[PDB]
Design a protein around this ligand. Structure first.
Ligand code: MG
Ligand code: ZN
Ligand code: ZN
Ligand code: ZN
Lengths: 113, 174, 97, 57, 109, 56, 401, 76
DNA sequence: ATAGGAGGTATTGTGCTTATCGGTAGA
RNA sequence: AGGAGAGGUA
DNA sequence: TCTACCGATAAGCACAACTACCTCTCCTAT
C-alpha cells in the first residue's frame, strides 16, 4: 500500500537502525541496500497523516478499483486529457463527472507545496 | 501494485549457535535476514527489502543432517509487482545507437527498442546522441515517465527485464 | 536338503509378524491400518514398561530359534520330526482338505 | 478382509509381477504403511525409533 | 574389508569380488534382527546411506516423474520437490514403466 | 594391455615360460612363489576327523 | 537449479496409457538404426549426453524413448476383460437378434484367448460351442450358414490362415468396431481404466539400463547391449497385419526382469531391494582369547589402520573405544547382533573373541568367520551401544533366562 | 495425558544421539562440564541434569498426539 | 540368409483356473 | 566386465 | 412335458523347492 510516502518513512528506520550495532557476524549483501537509496529519490511527500487519508477518500466516496489507484497516484497526472489517454479502462465511461476529478486534482495540488 | 502480502518460509538455522533462551529472538531474525539475502531474486513476485512485521513463528523441526533445525515463519514484507498498464518514471544511464539504457532502479535493467518512440535520426555531431527532433532533450539523470509492458525473466540471474514504450502522452522529462 | 524348511518357515512367519508392534496406549496393533491384534498384552508380568518394542518380531525370532535348534530331523516311521510337527502346527490354513 | 492394500509387500513376498499387474489393473493406492515398504524407499519403520518426533519448542 | 571401491554396473552397490574391495551383503535376517532390536538409524544407514543412494525429482502439481528438473506432461513449473530414495527404487520404477505400469507419487512436502 | 597384480596377489618370480600353438597364438606363463608359515587363523586337521584352528 | 526436499508417500498404481507414455519420453525418434541414440543414456558410443551434462554415469539418469505405431493396438493386459465382455454381449444385437433366439438356427459363440496354441499369437479367437454344433448336426445341418460371420467388418490386416470356418482370429480393428454401440457404463464397470484401452506406442529401455557396454574380455567397447534390444529395433518398422505386431509386443513385455523365467523375478527383488551390500565392512576368521573381556572384540592392527571412520572435527583410522556390530551368518536370532568395543591387538589377519560369547553367536572356532559393521554416523554409534550392546542383552528374550 | 510418564529406551537413545550430533557440530552446552572431551559424555550429563531443551511428541495410533518434555519425564 | 525324424521312454508338489458333465429345481 | 558349469567353507 | 444355473473330475499353468559364502573352468554361433 506504501507508494511514495509510507515507503520512505520506514526506510529511515533501517538507516537509523544501521548506525546502531553495525557489526554483523554473518555475510551481508550490498545490492539490496543500493536498491532502496536509488529508487525512492524520485518522488517524496511531506507528511504521512494527511496524505494517506486524502488518497483513500475517493475510494469510499467514488468507485475505484485497487489496481486503478496505484497507477494514477504514481503517475500523478496534472490534467484531465492525460488520465483519459494513459489507462484504457476509462474509455467510454460516464460514472464519474470530470469536474469532481478536476477538483481532486486541485486537492492533490495543494498537498504538494 | 505494492501490496504487502504474506510469504511463508522454511528457514533453517545451523547448530553453531543454539543458546541464550532469554535472547533467542536475536538469533531468529539474523537467520531470517540471511534467508532472502542468499536468493535476492524472484520469478513473478518482485523484490523484498526488510522484514518489518513478523506475524508468527512455528515449531522447530529437527532434520538429521549436518546438525540443522528448521523454523517455519510467516511474515509480511514490501513487494512490487510490475502489472501491465502502469506509468513508472525512470532515469537514463547511457545513450547508444541501439538499446537505449533506462535505469528505473538497480533492481532491473530496461532496454529501449526502436519501435517504441517517434521516428528520428540519431545525431552524431556530439558525444551523446540526442532526441531533440520533437522538441524534447533527454540526458542522463533526467526522470522520464513511461508505460511498462510484459516483463521477462532469466534462468540463473532471473532478471526482471522489460521493454520501455513512449507511445503514451506526457513523454519526456517533467 | 531339508535345511530349507526352517529358513522358509522363519521367512514366512517374519513376513506375517513383522508389522506387529506395541502402542503407547498399552494395546498391540498391526502397522497396516492400526489393526487391533490384542487389547492388552497377555504377559504373566512382571514389568509393563515395554512400549516401543516389536513384540511380533521377538516372537518370530524365538520361533526361528526353536526351528533351527530342532534340526535333528529323525523322521521315524509313522512319526514326524519336531521340525515337521512345528511346520504342520504353524500351517493351519493349508490343511483345509 | 481388512481392506488394507499393500501391493509392495505382497509383491516382495511372492510373484511380484502378477501382484504388480493386479494392483495396476485394480488401481489401488499404497500408503507405505508397512515397515519393509518404508525401508525399501528410505524411510524409518517407526516401531522402536521414529514413532515420536523431537521439537525444539 | 572395504572402505571405498567400484560399484556394480547394473545397481550402484559394492561388487562381490574380494580382491576388488568387496563389501558384505546385509541379508534379510540381519535386517529383521535389527528391527527386533529397534535400532533404525543403523538400519537406515546400512540400506540407504552406505548402500545405493540416489535422488528422484517429482513435480508437485502433477504426480509424475520429472528428469534442472523438468516434466513435459505439464508446463515449466517452479514447484518441484526432490526425494531421497535408493537407486533400487529408481530401477524398480524404470522396470515398471518398461513393463507398462505408471506410478504416481504424492509427496507430503 | 599389461596385466597388474591384484590386492591380495604377491610373491617372488620363479620361472617364466613362453610357448605357442600351431595356430601361432603366443602364451606366457609367470609363476610366483611364497612361503606360508603357520599363522594364527590357519586350520589344521587330524587323521580321525578332528578339525580346528590355531588358537595361540 | 535448486529444488526443495520432500518426503515420498502415497504411491499409486495405474496402467500406462499413450498420453503419459508420450509425455515421459524425450527425443523419441522413429529411426530403426537410432536405437542406441546419443540422447538416451551415457553408455552410448559417444560419451556425450544431449539432455544432460558430461558425467561418469553418476549424475545422469536413464532417459526414456517411445516409438510410434501406424495402427492402434489393443492393450494385452485388458485382453481378458474384453474377451469376457464380448462373450456376454451379442456380436450383432448389442444388448445384455438372430444370435439371441435358439429357433433361428444360430448357435451361441464363446470368446476366449489362446496362448501359443494355434499361431503363437495371444489374441481374441471366438469359438462356437461344439455341444450346440452336435445339436445342429443331428437336425440335418452340416455346415454353418454363409451369413454367420456377417457381423465382422472387412479388414485389410487379415492374412492367409485357412484354419477352420468355425474359428476366426479377431482383428484389432474389428475389436473397436464391436465395442461401438455399447453403453459406456457397462464398459467402465468391467474395465476401470478406459483411457488405457488404446496402445499406440511402446517405450524402449534406457541405455543406462539396457546398453551393456561391458569390457567383453578384450572388446572393451563391444557395446553388446541388451538382448531384447533386437526385438525393439525390429519393432521400429511395423506394417501389414497387426496381429504379428501385438505378438511381438507381448513377447517383448515378457523379457522384463520382474517376470519369472538367475537375477529375475523374486530373486531380482531380493538382490536389489531386500538384500543390499554396504561399505565399511570387514570379514575375518575368529579365534578364542580368554584374556579379552566379553564386551571387547580384538581387531588386528593391520586392518584397523586401513579401516576409516567418519569423525567430525575427514576420516581417521580405527582405534580403541569405537563400537562395531558383529554378526555370524545366518542370523537365527536377534542376539547375533552384538555391539563390542574395538580393542587393538598385535595379532594380524584374525579377530579375537572371548570363548564365553560363542553361545549368543552359536558358533565355534573351527573356521567360522565373523563379519562386522562399522557405523559412520554419530547417532548410529550412540544407538548401537544403548540397545544392541552386550550389557543391554543380558536377559534372553526367548525364555527370560 | 494417558501416557506411562516414563522415558523409554528408544526415546532416550534418540535424544542422546541428537544431542551428541548437535554438540559435535560445535554447539554451546547448557550444562557445565569439567574435563569432558566426548560429546556423548556431555549429552549423558545433560540428560542426568535434565537441562536439555527438547520436547517429545508422541503420536497416538488413532491420529492424535500428545506433547511432552524431557524435564517432565523421568529417566530410570 | 541357411543349418542344428523322431525314439519308448526312464521331478514332484501344492495352489489355481478352466472345461465338461451330468444333474436336479422350477414353470 | 557380465554370465553358464563344476568342486567346495561355516 | 423344457429351461437354468450348479456343484464335482480331469487338464493343464505357475511358483517353490534354504542362508553367508569361496575358488576354478569355459563363454560368447556359422
Ligand atoms: Mg563350525
Ligand atoms: Zn509437472
Ligand atoms: Zn542425460
Ligand atoms: Zn442379441
Amino acid at each position: 500500500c506504501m507508494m511514495d510516502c509510507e515507503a520512505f518513512q520506514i526506510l529511515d528506520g533501517i538507516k537509523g537502525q544501521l548506525v546502531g550495532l553495525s557489526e554483523d557476524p554473518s555475510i551481508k549483501i550490498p545490492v539490496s541496500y543500493d536498491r532502496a537509496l536509488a529508487y525512492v529519490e524520485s518522488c517524496v511527500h511531506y507528511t504521512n497523516p494527511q496524505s494517506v487519508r486524502k488518497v483513500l477518500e475517493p475510494l469510499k466516496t467514488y468507485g475505484i478499483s485497487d489496481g486503478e489507484m496505484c497507477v494514477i497516484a504514481n503517475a500523478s497526472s496534472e490534467s484531465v486529457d492525460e488520465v483519459l489517454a494513459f489507462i484504457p479502462s476509462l474509455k467510454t465511461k460516464k460514472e464519474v463527472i470530470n469536474q469532481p476529478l478536476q477538483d481532486a486534482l486541485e486537492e492533490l495540488s495543494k498537498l504538494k507545496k | 501494485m505494492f501490496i504487502k502480502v504474506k510469504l511463508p518460509w522454511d528457514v533453517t538455522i545451523p547448530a553453531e549457535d543454539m543458546d541464550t533462551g532469554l535472547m533467542l529472538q536475536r538469533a531468529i531474525v539474523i537467520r531470517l535476514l540471511e534467508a532472502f539475502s542468499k536468493e535476492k531474486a524472484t520469478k513473478d513476485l518482485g523484490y523484498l527489502i526488510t522484514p518489518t512485521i513478523l506475524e508468527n513463528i512455528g515449531e522447530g523441526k529437527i532434520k538429521e543432517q549436518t546438525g540443522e533445525i528448521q523454523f517455519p515463519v510467516v511474515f509480511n514484507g514490501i513487494c512490487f509487482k510490475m502489472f501491465k498498464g502502469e506509468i513508472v518514471h525512470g532515469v537514463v544511464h547511457k545513450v547508444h545507437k541501439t538499446g537505449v539504457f533506462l535505469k528505473s532502479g538497480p533492481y532491473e535493467i530496461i532496454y529501449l527498442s526502436h519501435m517504441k518512440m517517434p521516428g528520428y535520426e540519431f545525431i552524431p555531431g556530439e558525444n551523446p546522441f540526442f532526441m531533440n527532433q520533437y522538441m524534447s532533450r533527454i540526458q542522463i539523470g533526467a526522470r522520464v515517465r513511461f508505460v511498462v509492458l510484459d516483463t521477462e525473466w532469466r534462468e540463473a540471474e532471473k532478471d526482471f527485464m522489460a521493454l520501455a514504450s513512449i507511445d503514451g502522452d506526457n513523454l519526456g522529462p517533467f | 536338503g531339508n535345511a530349507d524348511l526352517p529358513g522358509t518357515l522363519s521367512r514366512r512367519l517374519m513376513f506375517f509378524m513383522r508389522d506387529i508392534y506395541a502402542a503407547y496406549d498399552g494395546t498391540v496393533r498391526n502397522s497396516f491400518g492400526n489393526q487391533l491384534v490384542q487389547f492388552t498384552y497377555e504377559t504373566d508380568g512382571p514389568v509393563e514398561d515395554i512400549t516401543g518394542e516389536a513384540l511380533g518380531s521377538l516372537s518370530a525370532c524365538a520361533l526361528s530359534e526353536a526351528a533351527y535348534s530342532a534340526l535333528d530331523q529323525p523322521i521315524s516311521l509313522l512319526e514326524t520330526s519336531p521340525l515337521l510337527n512345528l511346520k504342520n502346527v504353524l500351517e493351519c490354513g493349508s490343511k483345509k482338505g | 478382509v481388512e481392506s488394507t492394500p499393500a501391493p509392495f509387500t505382497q509383491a516382495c513376498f511372492s510373484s511380484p509381477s502378477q501382484c504388480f499387474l493386479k494392483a495396476a489393473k485394480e488401481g489401488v493406492r499404497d500408503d507405505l504403511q508397512g515397515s519393509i515398504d518404508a525401508l525399501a524407499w528410505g524411510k524409518v519403520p517407526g516401531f522402536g525409533t521414529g514413532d515420536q518426533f523431537e521439537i525444539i519448542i | 574389508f572395504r572402505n571405498t571401491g567400484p560399484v556394480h554396473p547394473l545397481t550402484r552397490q559394492p561388487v562381490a569380488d574380494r580382491k576388488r574391495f568387496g563389501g558384505i551383503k546385509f541379508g534379510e535376517m540381519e535386517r529383521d534382527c535389527l528391527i527386533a532390536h529397534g535400532a533404525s538409524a543403523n538400519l537406515h544407514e546400512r540400506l540407504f546411506t552406505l548402500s545405493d543412494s540416489s535422488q528422484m525429482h517429482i513435480c508437485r502439481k502433477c504426480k509424475t516423474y520429472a528428469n534442472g528438473p523438468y516434466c513435459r506432461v505439464c508446463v515449466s513449473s517452479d514447484h518441484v520437490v526432490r526425494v531421497y530414495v535408493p537407486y533400487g527404487a529408481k530401477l524398480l520404477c524404470q522396470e515398471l514403466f518398461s513393463m507398462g505400469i505408471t506410478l504416481n507419487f504424492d509427496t507430503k512436502l | 594391455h599389461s596385466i597388474k597384480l591384484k590386492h591380495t596377489e604377491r610373491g617372488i618370480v620363479q620361472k617364466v615360460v613362453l610357448s605357442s600353438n600351431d595356430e601361432g597364438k603366443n602364451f606366457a606363463a609367470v609363476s610366483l612363489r611364497q612361503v606360508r608359515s603357520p599363522c594364527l587363523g590357519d586350520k589344521f586337521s587330524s587323521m580321525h576327523g578332528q578339525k580346528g584352528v590355531l588358537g595361540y | 537449479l535448486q529444488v526443495p526436499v520432500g518426503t515420498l508417500t502415497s504411491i499409486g498404481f495405474s496402467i500406462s496409457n499413450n498420453n503419459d507414455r508420450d509425455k515421459m519420453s524425450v527425443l523419441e525418434v522413429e529411426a530403426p538404426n537410432q536405437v542406441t541414440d546419443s540422447r538416451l543414456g551415457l553408455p552410448n558410443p559417444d560419451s556425450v549426453c544431449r539432455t544432460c551434462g558430461s558425467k561418469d554415469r553418476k549424475v545422469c539418469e536413464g532417459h526414456f524413448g517411445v516409438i510410434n505405431f501406424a495402427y492402434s493396438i489393443i492393450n494385452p493386459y485388458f485382453l481378458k476383460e474384453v474377451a469376457a465382455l464380448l462373450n456376454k454381449i451379442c456380436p450383432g444385437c448389442k444388448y445384455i437378434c438372430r444370435y439371441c433366439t435358439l429357433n433361428t438356427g444360430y448357435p451361441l459363440m464363446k470368446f476366449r484367448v489362446t496362448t501359443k496354441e494355434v499361431f503363437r499369437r495371444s489374441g481374441i479367437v471366438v469359438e462356437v460351442n461344439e455341444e450346440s454344433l452336435m445339436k445342429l448336426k443331428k437336425r440335418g445341418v452340416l455346415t454353418l450358414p454363409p451369413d454367420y460371420w456377417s457381423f465382422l467388418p472387412q479388414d485389410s490386416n487379415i492374412d492367409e490362415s485357412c484354419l477352420k470356418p468355425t474359428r476366426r482370429i479377431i482383428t484389432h480393428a474389428q475389436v473397436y468396431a464391436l465395442l461401438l454401440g455399447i453403453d459406456q457404463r457397462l464398459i467402465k464397470k468391467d474395465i476401470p481404466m478406459f483411457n488405457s484401452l488404446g496402445l499406440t506406442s511402446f517405450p524402449v529401455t534406457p541405455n543406462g539400463y539396457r546398453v551393456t557396454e561391458i569390457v567383453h574380455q578384450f572388446n572393451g567397447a563391444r557395446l553388446i547391449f541388451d538382448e531384447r534390444t533386437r526385438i525393439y529395433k525390429k519393432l521400429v518398422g511395423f506394417e501389414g497385419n497387426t496381429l504379428e505386431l501385438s505378438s511381438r509386443v507381448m513377447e517383448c513385455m515378457q523379457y522384463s526382469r520382474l517376470f519369472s523365467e538367475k537375477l529375475c523375478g523374486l530373486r531380482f527383488m531380493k538382490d536389489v531391494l531386500l538384500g543390499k551390500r554396504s561399505d565399511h565392512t570387514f570379514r575375518t576368521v575368529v579365534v578364542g582369547d580368554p584374556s579379552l573381556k566379553l564386551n571387547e572384540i580384538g581387531i588386528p592392527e593391520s586392518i584397523a589402520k586401513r579401516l576409516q571412520v567418519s569423525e567430525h572435527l575427514i576420516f581417521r583410522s580405527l582405534m580403541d573405544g569405537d563400537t562395531v556390530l558383529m554378526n555370524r551368518p545366518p542370523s537365527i536370532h536377534q542376539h547375533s547382533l552384538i555391539a563390542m568395543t574395538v580393542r587393538i591387538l598385535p595379532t594380524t589377519s584374525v579377530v579375537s573373541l572371548n570363548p564365553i560369547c560363542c553361545l549368543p553367536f552359536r558358533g565355534d572356532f573351527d573356521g567360522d568367520c565373523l563379519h562386522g559393521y562399522v557405523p559412520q554416523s554419530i547417532q548410529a554409534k550412540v544407538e548401537l551401544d544403548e540397545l544392541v550392546a552386550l550389557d543391554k542383552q543380558l536377559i534372553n528374550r526367548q525364555n527370560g533366562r | 495425558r494417558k501416557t506411562s510418564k516414563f522415558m523409554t529406551k528408544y526415546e532416550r537413545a534418540r535424544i542422546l544421539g541428537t544431542r551428541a550430533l548437535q554438540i559435535s557440530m560445535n554447539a554451546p552446552v547448557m550444562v557445565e562440564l569439567e574435563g569432558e572431551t566426548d560429546p556423548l559424555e556431555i549429552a549423558m550429563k545433560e540428560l542426568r541434569q535434565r537441562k536439555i531443551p527438547f520436547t517429545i511428541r508422541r503420536y497416538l495410533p488413532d491420529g492424535s498426539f500428545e506433547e511432552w518434555g524431557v524435564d517432565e519425564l523421568i529417566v530410570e
